[PDB]
Amino acid sequence: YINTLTNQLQFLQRVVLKALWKHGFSWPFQQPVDAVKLKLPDYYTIIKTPMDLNTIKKRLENKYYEKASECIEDFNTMFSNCYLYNKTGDDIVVMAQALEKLFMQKLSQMPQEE
C-alpha cells in the first residue's frame, strides 16, 4: 500500500474507480484491512499483497502507474484477496462479486490500445 498518464489510465481513474467508489458495497474496500480492529489474526499470513481502493486512488493521482495493466492488476488483487481470505456465501464476498461485475462492465468500455 505505497504510492510513489495514458488514455486508458485516465479512463480507469475518471470512470472505473469513480463507479466503484460511489457504490454502496464499497466501504469495506475503501481502506486497508486492519487485522487487529477486525480481529483477523490470520489475515496477513494469508494475504501477502494487500490492496484497496484508496491505495489505487492515490496511485492514480500521483501517476504511480506506467500502464493500465498495472492498475487493472491492483483492482484484481483486491478482489482475489477477498475471495482467498473469506468463505463463499459471506456478505463481503457477495459485495466483492458485485463490485467486480461493475468493474468488468466499465472496463469493457475503456478505449482500445494503440
Binding site: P28, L38, K87, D90, D91, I92
Partner: peptide, 9 residues
C-alpha cells in the same frame, strides 16, 4: 470470517 455486513438488511 468478517461477519455480516448488513446484506439482507
Amino acid at each position: 470470517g468478517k461477519g455480516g455486513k448488513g446484506l439482507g438488511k
